[PDB]
Coordinates of C-alpha atoms in Angstrom, one line a residue:
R1 CA 17.3 -2.4 24.6
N2 CA 20.3 -1.8 26.7
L3 CA 24.3 -2.6 26.1
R4 CA 24.2 -4.6 29.5
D5 CA 21.2 -6.6 29.2
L6 CA 22.8 -7.1 25.4
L7 CA 26.0 -8.7 26.6
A8 CA 25.1 -10.1 29.9
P9 CA 25.3 -13.4 28.6
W10 CA 29.3 -13.0 27.2
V11 CA 30.4 -9.7 29.0
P12 CA 28.9 -9.4 32.7
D13 CA 29.0 -6.2 34.2
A14 CA 29.3 -4.3 30.6
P15 CA 28.1 -0.3 31.0
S16 CA 24.4 0.6 30.9
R17 CA 23.8 2.6 27.8
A18 CA 20.3 3.0 25.6
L19 CA 20.8 1.8 22.5
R20 CA 18.6 2.9 19.5
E21 CA 19.8 0.8 16.2
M22 CA 22.6 -1.7 15.6
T23 CA 24.6 -1.1 12.3
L24 CA 27.8 -2.3 10.6
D25 CA 27.9 0.8 8.6
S26 CA 29.7 3.6 10.1
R27 CA 28.3 6.1 7.6
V28 CA 24.6 5.7 9.0
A29 CA 26.0 5.1 12.4
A30 CA 24.0 7.8 14.5
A31 CA 23.1 9.5 17.8
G32 CA 22.5 6.5 20.3
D33 CA 23.3 3.5 17.9
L34 CA 25.5 0.7 18.5
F35 CA 28.4 0.5 15.7
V36 CA 29.4 -3.1 15.2
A37 CA 33.2 -3.0 13.9
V38 CA 34.0 -6.1 12.1
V39 CA 36.9 -7.5 9.8
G40 CA 35.9 -8.9 6.3
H41 CA 37.3 -9.2 3.1
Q42 CA 40.0 -6.6 2.8
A43 CA 38.0 -4.3 5.3
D44 CA 38.5 -3.4 9.1
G45 CA 35.2 -1.6 10.8
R46 CA 37.5 -0.6 13.7
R47 CA 39.0 1.9 11.2
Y48 CA 36.1 3.6 11.9
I49 CA 36.0 3.7 15.6
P50 CA 36.8 7.5 15.9
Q51 CA 33.9 8.2 12.9
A52 CA 31.6 6.5 14.8
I53 CA 32.2 8.3 18.2
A54 CA 32.3 11.7 16.5
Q55 CA 28.6 10.9 15.2
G56 CA 27.5 10.3 18.9
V57 CA 26.9 6.3 18.6
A58 CA 26.1 5.2 22.4
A59 CA 28.7 2.1 22.3
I60 CA 30.8 0.2 20.1
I61 CA 31.3 -3.7 20.0
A62 CA 34.7 -4.4 18.0
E63 CA 36.7 -7.5 16.9
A64 CA 39.3 -8.3 19.6
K65 CA 41.8 -10.3 16.9
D66 CA 45.2 -8.6 17.4
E67 CA 43.8 -5.4 19.6
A68 CA 42.2 -7.0 22.6
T69 CA 41.2 -9.8 24.8
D70 CA 37.8 -11.4 24.5
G71 CA 35.5 -9.1 26.6
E72 CA 37.9 -6.5 27.4
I73 CA 35.9 -3.5 28.0
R74 CA 37.7 -0.1 26.9
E75 CA 36.3 3.6 27.3
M76 CA 37.1 6.2 23.9
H77 CA 35.9 9.7 24.6
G78 CA 33.0 8.2 27.3
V79 CA 31.6 5.7 24.9
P80 CA 32.1 2.4 25.7
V81 CA 34.2 0.0 23.4
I82 CA 33.7 -3.7 24.1
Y83 CA 35.9 -6.1 22.2
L84 CA 34.8 -9.9 21.4
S85 CA 36.7 -12.3 19.7
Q86 CA 35.5 -14.5 16.5
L87 CA 32.6 -11.4 16.3
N88 CA 31.7 -12.5 12.7
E89 CA 30.6 -16.0 14.4
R90 CA 29.0 -14.4 17.1
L91 CA 27.2 -11.8 15.1
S92 CA 23.9 -13.6 14.5
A93 CA 23.5 -14.3 18.2
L94 CA 24.2 -10.8 19.3
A95 CA 21.8 -9.4 17.1
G96 CA 19.0 -11.9 17.7
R97 CA 19.6 -10.6 21.9
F98 CA 19.3 -7.2 20.4
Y99 CA 16.3 -7.7 18.2
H100 CA 14.2 -9.7 21.2
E101 CA 15.0 -13.0 19.8
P102 CA 12.4 -12.7 16.3
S103 CA 13.0 -16.5 15.5
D104 CA 11.8 -17.5 18.6
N105 CA 8.7 -15.5 18.3
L106 CA 7.3 -17.1 15.0
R107 CA 7.5 -20.5 13.1
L108 CA 11.0 -19.9 11.0
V109 CA 11.5 -22.8 8.2
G110 CA 14.9 -22.5 6.7
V111 CA 14.9 -23.8 2.8
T112 CA 18.3 -24.8 1.6
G113 CA 19.5 -26.0 -2.1
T114 CA 20.3 -24.9 -5.6
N115 CA 16.8 -25.6 -7.0
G116 CA 13.2 -25.0 -6.2
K117 CA 14.3 -22.9 -3.2
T118 CA 12.2 -20.0 -4.3
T119 CA 9.2 -22.1 -4.8
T120 CA 9.1 -24.1 -2.3
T121 CA 9.8 -21.1 0.4
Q122 CA 6.6 -19.4 -1.5
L123 CA 4.4 -22.5 -1.2
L124 CA 5.3 -23.0 2.4
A125 CA 4.6 -19.3 3.1
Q126 CA 1.1 -19.8 1.1
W127 CA -0.2 -23.1 2.8
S128 CA 0.5 -21.9 6.1
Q129 CA -1.3 -18.7 5.8
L130 CA -4.3 -20.9 4.0
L131 CA -3.9 -22.8 7.4
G132 CA -4.4 -19.7 9.4
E133 CA -0.8 -18.4 9.9
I134 CA 0.0 -15.1 9.1
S135 CA 2.9 -15.8 6.8
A136 CA 5.9 -14.1 5.3
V137 CA 9.1 -14.8 3.0
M138 CA 12.6 -13.9 3.2
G139 CA 14.3 -14.4 0.0
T140 CA 16.4 -13.0 -3.2
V141 CA 13.4 -11.9 -4.4
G142 CA 12.6 -9.4 -1.4
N143 CA 11.3 -9.6 2.3
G144 CA 7.5 -9.2 3.4
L145 CA 4.4 -10.2 4.5
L146 CA 2.8 -12.5 1.9
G147 CA 1.6 -10.3 -0.9
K148 CA 3.6 -7.5 0.2
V149 CA 7.2 -8.6 -0.6
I150 CA 9.3 -5.5 -0.7
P151 CA 12.7 -6.0 -3.3
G152 CA 23.2 -8.6 3.5
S153 CA 24.6 -9.4 6.9
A154 CA 24.0 -11.5 9.8
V155 CA 22.5 -8.1 11.6
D156 CA 19.8 -7.5 8.2
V157 CA 18.8 -11.1 8.8
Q158 CA 18.0 -10.5 12.4
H159 CA 16.4 -6.9 11.8
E160 CA 14.2 -8.1 9.1
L161 CA 13.0 -10.8 11.3
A162 CA 12.0 -8.8 13.9
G163 CA 10.6 -6.4 11.7
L164 CA 7.9 -9.2 10.5
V165 CA 7.3 -10.1 13.7
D166 CA 6.1 -6.3 14.6
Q167 CA 3.9 -6.5 11.4
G168 CA 2.2 -9.4 13.0
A169 CA 4.0 -12.5 11.3
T170 CA 3.7 -16.0 12.9
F171 CA 5.7 -17.8 9.9
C172 CA 8.5 -17.3 8.2
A173 CA 9.8 -19.4 5.1
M174 CA 13.5 -18.3 4.6
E175 CA 15.6 -18.7 1.4
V176 CA 18.9 -19.8 3.0
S177 CA 21.9 -19.0 0.4
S178 CA 24.7 -21.7 0.6
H179 CA 27.4 -18.5 1.1
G180 CA 25.1 -16.8 3.8
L181 CA 25.5 -20.3 5.7
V182 CA 29.3 -20.3 5.8
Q183 CA 29.3 -16.9 6.3
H184 CA 27.2 -17.3 9.5
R185 CA 24.3 -15.1 8.9
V186 CA 21.9 -17.7 10.2
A187 CA 24.0 -19.0 12.9
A188 CA 21.7 -17.7 15.7
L189 CA 18.3 -18.6 14.3
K190 CA 15.8 -21.0 15.9
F191 CA 14.8 -22.8 12.7
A192 CA 11.4 -25.0 13.5
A193 CA 12.4 -27.0 10.1
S194 CA 14.9 -26.9 7.5
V195 CA 14.4 -28.0 4.2
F196 CA 17.1 -29.6 1.9
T197 CA 15.8 -29.3 -1.9
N198 CA 19.0 -31.0 -2.7
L199 CA 22.6 -31.2 -1.0
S200 CA 24.6 -32.5 -4.5
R201 CA 26.8 -29.7 -6.3
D202 CA 28.7 -29.9 -9.6
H203 CA 32.6 -30.3 -9.5
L204 CA 32.8 -32.8 -7.1
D205 CA 33.6 -35.8 -9.2
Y206 CA 36.5 -36.7 -7.5
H207 CA 35.7 -38.9 -4.0
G208 CA 38.2 -36.8 -1.8
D209 CA 36.5 -34.0 -3.1
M210 CA 32.7 -34.9 -2.3
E211 CA 34.0 -36.3 1.3
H212 CA 35.5 -32.9 1.7
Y213 CA 32.3 -30.9 0.7
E214 CA 30.1 -33.4 2.8
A215 CA 32.3 -32.6 5.7
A216 CA 32.0 -28.7 5.4
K217 CA 28.4 -28.9 5.4
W218 CA 27.9 -31.4 8.3
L219 CA 29.9 -29.4 10.4
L220 CA 27.9 -26.3 9.6
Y221 CA 24.8 -27.8 9.9
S222 CA 25.5 -29.7 13.3
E223 CA 26.4 -25.9 14.6
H224 CA 22.8 -24.7 13.8
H225 CA 19.4 -25.3 15.0
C226 CA 18.2 -26.7 12.0
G227 CA 15.1 -28.2 13.8
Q228 CA 12.8 -30.9 11.5
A229 CA 15.0 -31.9 8.6
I230 CA 13.3 -32.2 5.5
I231 CA 15.1 -34.0 3.0
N232 CA 14.7 -34.5 -0.9
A233 CA 15.8 -38.4 -1.2
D234 CA 15.8 -38.0 -5.4
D235 CA 19.3 -36.5 -4.4
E236 CA 22.1 -39.1 -4.1
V237 CA 23.8 -36.6 -1.2
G238 CA 19.9 -36.1 0.5
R239 CA 19.7 -40.0 0.4
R240 CA 23.3 -40.5 2.3
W241 CA 22.1 -38.0 4.7
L242 CA 18.8 -39.6 5.5
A243 CA 20.8 -42.6 6.2
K244 CA 22.5 -40.5 9.1
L245 CA 19.2 -38.9 10.6
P246 CA 16.8 -41.4 11.7
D247 CA 14.3 -38.4 12.8
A248 CA 14.7 -36.7 9.1
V249 CA 11.6 -36.9 7.3
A250 CA 12.3 -38.6 3.5
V251 CA 10.6 -37.0 0.5
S252 CA 10.5 -38.6 -2.7
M253 CA 8.6 -38.8 -6.5
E254 CA 11.0 -41.4 -8.0
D255 CA 10.8 -44.2 -5.6
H256 CA 13.4 -43.5 -3.0
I257 CA 12.0 -44.0 0.0
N258 CA 13.0 -47.3 2.1
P259 CA 10.3 -48.6 4.2
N260 CA 12.7 -50.8 6.2
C261 CA 14.0 -47.7 7.8
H262 CA 10.5 -47.0 10.1
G263 CA 11.2 -43.1 9.7
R264 CA 8.9 -40.6 8.5
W265 CA 8.3 -40.3 4.7
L266 CA 6.4 -38.9 2.2
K267 CA 6.1 -39.9 -1.5
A268 CA 4.0 -39.5 -4.7
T269 CA 3.0 -42.7 -6.1
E270 CA 1.6 -41.3 -9.3
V271 CA 1.2 -37.9 -11.0
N272 CA -1.4 -37.0 -13.8
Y273 CA -0.1 -34.1 -15.2
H274 CA -2.9 -32.7 -17.2
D275 CA -4.1 -29.3 -18.9
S276 CA -4.6 -27.4 -15.5
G277 CA -1.9 -28.6 -13.5
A278 CA -1.6 -32.3 -11.6
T279 CA -3.3 -34.7 -9.9
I280 CA -1.0 -36.0 -7.3
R281 CA -1.7 -39.4 -5.1
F282 CA 0.9 -39.9 -2.7
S283 CA 1.4 -42.1 0.8
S284 CA 3.2 -40.8 3.8
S285 CA 3.7 -41.8 7.7
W286 CA 1.1 -39.7 8.2
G287 CA -1.7 -41.3 5.9
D288 CA -2.4 -41.1 2.0
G289 CA -4.4 -39.0 -0.2
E290 CA -4.6 -37.0 -3.4
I291 CA -3.8 -33.5 -4.2
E292 CA -5.3 -31.3 -6.9
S293 CA -2.0 -29.2 -7.7
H294 CA -2.3 -25.8 -10.2
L295 CA 1.3 -25.5 -10.3
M296 CA 2.7 -27.2 -13.6
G297 CA 6.0 -29.4 -14.3
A298 CA 7.9 -32.2 -12.2
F299 CA 9.6 -29.7 -10.4
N300 CA 6.5 -28.1 -8.9
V301 CA 5.3 -31.5 -7.7
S302 CA 8.5 -32.0 -5.8
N303 CA 8.5 -28.8 -4.7
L304 CA 4.6 -29.1 -3.5
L305 CA 5.8 -32.4 -1.5
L306 CA 8.5 -30.9 -0.1
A307 CA 6.2 -28.1 1.5
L308 CA 3.7 -30.7 2.5
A309 CA 6.3 -32.9 4.3
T310 CA 7.4 -30.4 6.5
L311 CA 4.2 -28.9 7.2
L312 CA 3.0 -32.5 8.3
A313 CA 6.3 -32.2 10.6
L314 CA 5.3 -29.2 12.2
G315 CA 1.8 -30.9 13.0
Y316 CA -0.5 -29.1 10.7
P317 CA -3.2 -31.7 10.4
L318 CA -3.0 -33.9 7.0
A319 CA -6.8 -33.1 6.5
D320 CA -6.3 -29.6 6.6
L321 CA -3.5 -29.3 4.6
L322 CA -5.4 -31.6 1.6
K323 CA -8.8 -29.2 2.2
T324 CA -6.6 -26.1 1.1
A325 CA -3.7 -27.3 -1.3
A326 CA -6.2 -26.3 -4.3
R327 CA -5.7 -22.8 -3.4
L328 CA -1.6 -23.1 -3.8
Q329 CA -1.0 -20.7 -6.6
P330 CA 2.1 -20.6 -8.8
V331 CA 5.2 -18.3 -8.2
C332 CA 4.4 -14.9 -10.3
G333 CA 5.2 -15.4 -13.9
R334 CA 6.7 -19.1 -13.3
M335 CA 4.9 -21.6 -15.2
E336 CA 1.5 -19.9 -14.6
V337 CA -1.2 -21.8 -16.4
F338 CA -4.3 -20.1 -18.3
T339 CA -7.1 -22.3 -18.7
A340 CA -10.5 -21.9 -20.3
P341 CA -13.4 -24.1 -21.7
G342 CA -12.9 -25.4 -25.3
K343 CA -9.6 -23.7 -25.4
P344 CA -6.0 -24.5 -25.5
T345 CA -3.8 -24.2 -22.1
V346 CA -1.7 -21.5 -22.1
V347 CA 1.8 -21.3 -19.7
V348 CA 3.0 -17.8 -19.4
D349 CA 6.6 -18.4 -18.0
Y350 CA 9.5 -15.8 -17.6
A351 CA 12.2 -18.0 -19.2
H352 CA 14.7 -15.9 -21.4
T353 CA 17.6 -18.1 -21.6
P354 CA 18.3 -21.5 -23.4
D355 CA 18.3 -23.6 -20.2
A356 CA 15.4 -22.0 -18.9
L357 CA 13.3 -22.0 -22.1
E358 CA 14.1 -26.0 -22.2
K359 CA 13.1 -26.6 -18.7
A360 CA 9.3 -24.6 -19.4
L361 CA 9.0 -26.4 -22.7
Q362 CA 10.0 -29.9 -20.6
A363 CA 7.7 -29.0 -17.8
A364 CA 4.5 -28.0 -20.4
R365 CA 5.2 -31.4 -22.7
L366 CA 3.9 -33.2 -19.6
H367 CA 0.7 -31.2 -19.5
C368 CA 0.2 -31.5 -23.2
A369 CA -1.8 -34.1 -24.9
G370 CA -1.8 -32.3 -28.5
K371 CA 0.9 -30.2 -29.8
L372 CA 3.3 -27.9 -27.9
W373 CA 3.6 -24.1 -29.2
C374 CA 6.5 -22.0 -27.9
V375 CA 6.0 -18.0 -28.4
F376 CA 9.0 -16.3 -27.6
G377 CA 11.7 -13.8 -28.7
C378 CA 15.2 -12.2 -27.5
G379 CA 15.9 -8.5 -25.9
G380 CA 17.5 -6.4 -28.6
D381 CA 20.6 -4.4 -27.4
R382 CA 22.0 -7.3 -24.8
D383 CA 24.2 -10.0 -26.0
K384 CA 23.3 -12.4 -28.9
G385 CA 24.8 -15.2 -27.8
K386 CA 21.8 -16.6 -26.8
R387 CA 19.7 -16.1 -29.7
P388 CA 20.5 -19.2 -32.2
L389 CA 20.7 -21.2 -28.7
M390 CA 17.2 -20.6 -28.2
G391 CA 16.3 -21.1 -31.4
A392 CA 17.2 -24.9 -31.4
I393 CA 15.6 -25.5 -28.3
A394 CA 12.6 -24.1 -29.4
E395 CA 12.6 -26.4 -32.5
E396 CA 13.6 -29.6 -30.4
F397 CA 11.4 -29.5 -27.5
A398 CA 8.2 -28.0 -28.9
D399 CA 6.2 -28.5 -32.1
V400 CA 5.4 -25.2 -33.2
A401 CA 8.0 -22.6 -32.8
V402 CA 6.2 -18.9 -32.9
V403 CA 9.1 -16.0 -33.1
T404 CA 8.4 -12.9 -32.0
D405 CA 9.5 -10.1 -30.6
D406 CA 10.9 -9.2 -26.9
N407 CA 12.1 -5.8 -25.6
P408 CA 13.7 -5.2 -29.2
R409 CA 14.7 -1.9 -27.6
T410 CA 17.0 0.3 -30.7
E411 CA 18.0 -3.0 -32.3
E412 CA 16.2 -4.0 -35.4
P413 CA 13.4 -5.9 -34.6
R414 CA 13.8 -8.5 -37.7
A415 CA 17.5 -9.0 -37.2
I416 CA 17.1 -10.4 -33.8
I417 CA 14.6 -12.8 -35.1
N418 CA 17.1 -13.8 -37.9
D419 CA 19.6 -14.5 -35.1
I420 CA 17.2 -16.5 -33.6
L421 CA 16.5 -18.5 -36.8
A422 CA 19.8 -18.9 -37.8
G423 CA 20.2 -21.3 -34.6
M424 CA 17.6 -23.8 -36.3
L425 CA 18.0 -26.9 -38.6
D426 CA 14.9 -26.0 -40.4
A427 CA 14.0 -22.2 -40.0
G428 CA 11.6 -22.3 -42.8
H429 CA 9.2 -24.7 -40.2
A430 CA 9.4 -21.9 -37.8
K431 CA 6.4 -19.2 -37.6
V432 CA 7.5 -15.7 -37.4
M433 CA 5.2 -13.1 -36.5
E434 CA 6.1 -9.7 -35.7
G435 CA 4.2 -7.4 -32.9
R436 CA 4.3 -10.0 -30.0
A437 CA 0.7 -9.4 -29.3
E438 CA -0.2 -10.6 -32.8
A439 CA 2.1 -13.7 -32.7
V440 CA 0.3 -14.8 -29.1
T441 CA -3.0 -14.6 -30.9
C442 CA -1.7 -16.4 -33.8
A443 CA -0.6 -19.3 -31.5
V444 CA -3.8 -19.2 -28.9
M445 CA -6.4 -18.9 -31.9
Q446 CA -4.8 -21.9 -33.9
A447 CA -3.8 -24.0 -31.4
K448 CA -6.5 -27.3 -30.9
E449 CA -8.1 -27.8 -27.4
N450 CA -5.5 -30.0 -26.2
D451 CA -2.5 -28.2 -27.0
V452 CA -0.4 -26.3 -25.0
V453 CA 1.0 -22.9 -25.7
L454 CA 4.0 -21.5 -24.0
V455 CA 4.2 -17.9 -23.9
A456 CA 8.1 -17.4 -22.6
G457 CA 10.2 -14.0 -21.8
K458 CA 8.2 -11.8 -19.9
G459 CA 6.1 -13.8 -16.8
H460 CA 4.7 -10.6 -15.1
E461 CA 7.1 -8.0 -16.5
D462 CA 4.3 -5.8 -18.0
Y463 CA 6.0 -4.0 -20.6
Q464 CA 7.5 -4.2 -24.5
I465 CA 10.4 -1.9 -24.9
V466 CA 10.4 -0.4 -28.6
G467 CA 13.0 2.2 -29.3
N468 CA 13.2 4.3 -26.1
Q469 CA 9.7 3.7 -25.1
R470 CA 8.1 1.4 -22.4
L471 CA 5.1 0.6 -24.0
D472 CA 2.3 -0.8 -21.6
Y473 CA 1.8 -4.8 -22.8
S474 CA 1.0 -7.7 -20.8
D475 CA 1.6 -11.6 -21.9
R476 CA -0.9 -12.5 -19.0
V477 CA -3.4 -9.9 -19.5
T478 CA -3.3 -10.9 -23.5
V479 CA -3.4 -14.4 -22.7
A480 CA -6.7 -14.0 -20.2
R481 CA -8.6 -11.4 -22.8
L482 CA -8.2 -14.2 -25.5
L483 CA -9.1 -17.2 -23.6
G484 CA -12.2 -15.1 -22.0
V485 CA -10.5 -15.4 -18.3
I486 CA -9.3 -12.7 -15.9
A487 CA -5.6 -12.3 -15.3

């Protein structure tokens, strides 16, 4: 890493300096570092140029706005200070070059949209790895090689990606936030593929507003190296964009493929939702097939189909994808199914809000031939507002509501339960059982073979907070033990 080589594409004959790390934060800028001084929200890193120099940085790259001409090379206390216009816009490119273009040295897939981003990202990484990649994820959860995810600027994005390259990653599935995209955080990344789980947004009922929204986003995407575009056609905006993008892949499970266009497509033709997952029959421009998914709900059918279409577009053979599909697993604590011979199906899900609980129950229902049971509670010493709403939801969308404890903390456990019951039309029809373990057991042992039991609120959060004590407890382990299987 040399300053001169670093800047060669933009500033000829920049001074030669060995560079250590690249940072935006003057507080950590150390001997040999490249400090980058940017202007943001009510912030100007140029203020800290003296501090960075005093700390022994090798060089500084700074925003030119109001202070210098683009490419102007200055010298302060012997330290090169090079000014660049539109530095925020160029930061990704600058960092890309600093870190030896990590996105040129693995297959990067970007996933954007409001729903299904996390799951689709995980499925991409999982499936590619089953096909022989060493895969990684970058997301809100965290970054890392698959199964080693560690819990944000354009520089951090490039740094992290370079870290993954160093660890031997050949494939990375990256969640891209709307905000991140707008702030140029992935501007210089070479995406092999871009997955659009949806393109619609709330608050755009005015035609003028939808037009502006689409224009802003279209402009943004036009400035990125998106690679192959894989678009959910069950989204209204998705369909409109597909009509303008003849090389994009159209994906649907609700009959939104237009065969007249002769483009690439993938669609579910039928789904059988059963106890252990979904049997998904699909047709595609690559051929037809059947996948045995071990994921639950209609949304996860969509997420799987998006991942499949993406990997097909990237050239992974259909036969190999089909051969590995049955090994795709649920995201940790998310609609995780446990089945056992002659026992009810049990789903462990993290849902702990009204909206999430409703979605979870709707998903579980699709796999439920018999009665749907819902075992849940609400956290103590937190906002009480959700309590009656979650009560109402369990009553409406499940057949049997089993109300129990979920991290009561220092609050009277039965008071929390009463708050939940208060939201129900017929509280008397709910089952109340305290001791969460006991409640789970009640449901599992009483449910019929063709019933489904949703155990909501925790996912893989393996503790129960009672008073001030974080007690060892796991829904997954409790469920597995009851069913005679291994969590």
